[PDB]
Symmetry: C4
Subunit: 299 residues, 4 copies
């Protein structure tokens, strides 16, 4: 039988409320990014050219999490970007290094030299982003990094096989999230399948792609995820790459729509995670894996 | 496994007709609001500032149901709004207290000073509402009322069976059931089912709150264990609702919400739907409905 | 558990092709309306005031099937519409004729109208149809008992949906049974209905009629295939010429006095019969009999 | 018990990513059409009067494919459309063992026609029909084999039918069946048909219901050897109509689509990628290592 079974997305389920003693405020947002790296809030900016560059990795680490930079630039620009973040001259929170600064990241395309001048410039994590992680060309760029430079997050997968197979070769964290090619696995039943294995092993999960509203990210961590990757919903903000076009009745980031000051967006999303964790009586993300429960919504 | 069951809404089900002797007009719609407070029809008007103040709660009571004055005001104000109802010194299907005056209820917020004055005011039932009802703060405001005061108490919003066990065990006389930014909820039919597992065993009546678009839903609620439904947005711009009238684009608005005319037309229609459902299901009472009700699973179409 | 299963309607199903050796044109479309009465095409026009009166009851019985005069009128004038159809004296080829060789008519009654029945039978009516919104009632069983014990005749159920309902109804003497039922929140999807009602309809020679849920030619195929012997079309014969009303042009489309226009009903019946033929051909069935025997279907997830 | 389970279509399932040894730009699209005709891409153009004449069968077989000339013209008219293909006077061509491009022709219950098209030297005769598992379709298929060729039989979905048709004569099996009220959702239909016919090297052809490049991926993955594309090629320059502009957009009646190489290259790149994710070097590879999951409309 080629038919595995019913695969669920965020729109497919709602979360069941539990006995609660914790208020929205009290809740602990701290959690692990890799093993040796950790995030104060469980949100990390996406490795998309239209979203995450400079002022972004700023707002990302000073508000609690990390920010990942893309592979679509000449070396010295990803090197002169990471080094522009770590360097600085009532923003409370603030995620820092061990030599106490800021936090950043980078994308690696399957190459090894870009991973070199990155790690040397002092990069906290580097991600092996690839439209299909479970391979030979990627399974290998692992060992070709482990035995030279660092905590590595390997690119996107959706299978239980693709996660045992990956962590063995030293996968220090996993990105899950795979019309045209006709391939995919709905996001919930992915994380449900990928952390069913990424545990026992101390290896966290990053839910990449599909994040529309606050009550989405709740379900992600609830299911296994240790963090969540935020792309399109930050796409056109002020602190991202684009210029500005004023053309009547509307304003764009040059082509994409302007989504204002980024802080607000990360505030309204954190606020959602807070209200979610309240309802569910999870005091902290580790508690949300123990005390979850969800029902299926036949729309 | 995290996936428990599949959850169901009113829209997911259609009730199944059984053998029937009794006519839509000959059915009794008496139910219970709490162990000590009855109703003549199973409709309660929400504790929303767009729905119920005084003139609304009086409309409700005179028709069998009751109103629950919202808490979105001063303590002084709310004590006066319950009074105006207590002192209404025909209307044959009216709901009176053991003292011969119209019944009324009032909403209350987590953590008592408001409670006291309302129980002092003559309010009949106290509704302690919350986004999340199975919490420690809410249980704490429940036993810390039942010791200082003696009034009947309806509690919070709850969707799980664990939650309705504890609230009863702590002295709730009724419990209501109803829970995108959230990401949290169990659907109404599956919620009303689970909460009745526990409640219909202690004789404690359930109130079905929110999710009520039209007549069909009111029947479908009570059939799956609810003792009464609570109506809200359906009564939003009605003459007895709090706002003031005003004309904009050749249509009448309130305060903004689109005005719905006289309330009684709304509540007669709804009752007419319920009477009609218990006819198809051969039920001359609500406790009859609980015993002989059936439903099927609908996929859109 | 109050969950008694899933409820499937027409658009949840698709009929599965079988080994075939009959073409559309080759097929038998003959069936039973009751034990005693029978139809040449399995189509009843409704008993709504907007579709079946004398003029509509004729084009149905000419083309093979039948029509049931709506009850929304006085006693004597319904008798007149009845005796108007039993009297068509001046190709037909498919005409449904009785024992005297006149056109076939059925008529509708309700509540406990015992006197309307007496008047209709003696006027020559072939069936009486006892409608209630809910037919599994003590008031419909009291009326069935009393019509069947007295005025001979063939009586139709009313409106049932469960199997206990059709069972209880045949016990008291129902010759034909009728299946079909937001303001109330009640109902059972039409496929799931005809199946369970048909699970009890056979075992006795009692045929089942499909009332409601009928939009397209292909919902007729789906209904008879699951058990029905007859389907009752009505919604879609409302604007036709032969239904009561008044051609009355407003704006740029012709209406009725209140529904939109549909032209000649012959054109619809011929469209529906011809689509049934195409279906029966895919299922490799030369009758409804054979259809029931070899039918099969799968569930569609719409998209 | 009547109902025989939930049937699935392309939109209900997504494919599940496997262990991947292979690349996109490096897979053997190659496959089988009939027990003995091979194709360089698994796409065959349909026999609709509004899709496949000569200029199109050419476009197909030139790109690795093949095209079935329709039965909507007198015997003569059609036979000349075949002649124009078995007679061209870039690489990756699909040619028969004598160095001439490959053509199919359709027929449906019609010996006299069938012999002629064979005589004009056609590769495949296609016994197309509404309901394929009929009597008049067995007898037509039989009489044809006992008087000459290659034969495909016309749209079945039930597994029984894929058997009574192979059992006596069939070389390939085409799968695909509002007013109608009949059919089996496409994925379930291929699947049901493959399981009862993959045994013999008899290829199943996925006929119709196709939309985006993904669908081709899905359709083979489950068991089909080749997928036929119909309404996606309809209004391209190499099809039947004539070009004329009426208000903004150009038509043929149906909206214009442009060169057909572009409809195919894009469709070629979708199978490239699909197989890349499901890490199969070949099509026969894929029918051994293919998992899928269900989606709901939400």
């Amino acid at each position: 039988t080629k038919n595995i079974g019913k695969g669920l997305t965020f729109e497919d389920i709602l979360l069941v409320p539990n006995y609660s003693e914790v208020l929205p405020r009290e809740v602990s947002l701290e959690t692990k990014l890799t093993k040796n790296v950790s995030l104060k809030i469980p949100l990390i900016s996406s490795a998309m050219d239209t979203v995450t560059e400079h002022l972004m990795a700023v707002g990302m680490a000073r508000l609690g999490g990390i920010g990942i930079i893309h592979k679509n630039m000449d070396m010295e620009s990803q090197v002169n970007e990471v080094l522009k973040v770590k360097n600085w001259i009532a923003y409370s929170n603030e995620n820092l290094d061990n030599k106490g600064r800021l936090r950043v990241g980078a994308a690696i395309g399957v190459e090894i030299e870009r991973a070199k001048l990155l790690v040397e410039a002092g990069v906290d994590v580097i991600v092996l982003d690839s439209a299909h992680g479970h391979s030979l060309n990627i399974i290998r760029t692992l060992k070709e990094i482990k035995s030279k430079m660092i905590d590595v997050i390997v690119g996107n997968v959706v299978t239980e096989e693709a996660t045992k197979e990956l962590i063995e070769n030293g996968a220090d964290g996993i990105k899950v999230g795979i019309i045209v090619a006709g391939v995919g696995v709905p996001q919930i039943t992915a994380i449900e399948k990928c952390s069913s294995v990424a545990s026992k092993f101390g290896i966290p999960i990053i839910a990449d792609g599909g994040i529309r509203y606050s009550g989405d990210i709740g379900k992600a961590l609830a299911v296994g995820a240790s963090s969540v990757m935020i792309g399109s919903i930050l796409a056109g903000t002020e602190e991202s790459p684009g210029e500005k076009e004023l053309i009547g009745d509307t304003v764009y980031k040059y082509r994409v729509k302007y989504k204002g000051e980024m802080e607000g967006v990360v505030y309204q999303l954190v606020g959602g995670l807070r209200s979610c964790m309240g309802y569910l009586g999870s005091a902290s993300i580790e508690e949300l894996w123990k005390k979850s429960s969800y029902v299926e919504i036949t729309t």
